[PDB]
Amino acid sequence: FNLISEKCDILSILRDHPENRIYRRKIEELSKRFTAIRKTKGDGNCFYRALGYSYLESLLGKSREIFKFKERVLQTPNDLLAAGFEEHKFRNFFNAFYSVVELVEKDGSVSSLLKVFNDQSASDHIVQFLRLLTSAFIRNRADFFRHFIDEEMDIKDFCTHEVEPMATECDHIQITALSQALSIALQVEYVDEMDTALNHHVFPEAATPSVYLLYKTSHYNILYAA
Ligand SMILES: *CC(=O)NNC(=O)[C@H]1C[C@@H]1c1cccc(C)c1
Numbered sequence: 001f002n003l004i005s006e007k008c009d010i011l012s013i014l015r016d017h018p019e020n021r022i023y024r025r026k027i028e029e030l031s032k033r034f035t036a037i038r039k040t041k042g043d044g045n046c047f048y049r050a051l052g053y054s055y056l057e058s059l060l061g062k063s064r065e066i067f068k069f070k071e072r073v074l075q076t077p078n079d080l081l082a083a084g085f086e087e088h089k090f091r092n093f094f095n096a097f098y099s100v101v102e103l104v105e106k107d108g109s110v111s112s113l114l115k116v117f118n119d120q121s122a123s124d125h126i127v128q129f130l131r132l133l134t135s136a137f138i139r140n141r142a143d144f145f146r147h148f149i150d151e152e153m154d155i156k157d158f159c160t161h162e163v164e165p166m167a168t169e170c171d172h173i174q175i176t177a178l179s180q181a182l183s184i185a186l187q188v189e190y191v192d193e194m195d196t197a198l199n200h201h202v203f204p205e206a207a208t209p210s211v212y213l214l215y216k217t218s219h220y221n222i223l224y225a226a
Pocket of ligand 1: 041042043044045046047169218219220
């Protein structure tokens, strides 16, 4: 469980980490709404790996939701080609992601899903797929995403260097692109109330996110609603 941990009670964030006790107030509030966390490896990939795992986990047993998600996934090869990705280059990453979608579709357990996401090779192929889809999404909407980058930076160069490569850290750009790309309603909770970084992924309670992530200093763990 080196890439995605077993569940820990939310208050482990305080009990195990003296360094977090300054965030006691936020964590104790979150503990009213969320019961548990899974920890993700801090390797530059944690957003993609957290969102992939958490969303597929959210689908287990929801056969209609799985069906509609499989349809979106079967369309992604065309989105990738429209963005200039050749099939022979994305095939193995598509196949890894398709495989874990079929695992969830065929009754699939949390245990079997965790095993794929803790397999370095399978998990990193899934992350690479999610990175290419993120890049494809941004490239296809250069006009929109152009607003959020460095004027001197080309959108294609941003994607080449800050989205496609493994271990490249996310900003709100990649979170927006991937969530829109797969229609994953995501909510990000912050550990640190004093962190001023604008949150583009917090909505009112009445919204129905699939995935809740817990953010601190470039790192995203998975949250479980109470
Ligand atoms: C989401 C994600 O993977 N976040 N990244 C981390 O937690 C990276 C920051 C930590 C790290 C890894 C290797 C080396 C250093 C100096 C930091």
